[PDB]
Amino acid sequence: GSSGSSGAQEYRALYDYTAQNPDELDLSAGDILEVILEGEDGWWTVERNGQRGFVPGSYLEKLSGPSSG
Secondary structure (H helix, E strand, C coil), X not given: CCCCCCCCCEXXXXXXXXXXXXXXXXXXXXXXXXXXXXXXXXXEEEEECCEEEEEEHHHCCECCCCCCC
């Protein structure tokens, strides 16, 4: 089980989000994504399987606890 030290701020969706435009990404409670940048307005930048999109942080959750979870 190789892991190392380097990682990435993972975020677990909280509620299913349907991207109206082909630009935004559809979220889903449980989906594991990464936050590239933080928007001051609300539009957060996250990537999933190489694909990039834009979704509101409100529909995100920072997973804390690399152990016992």
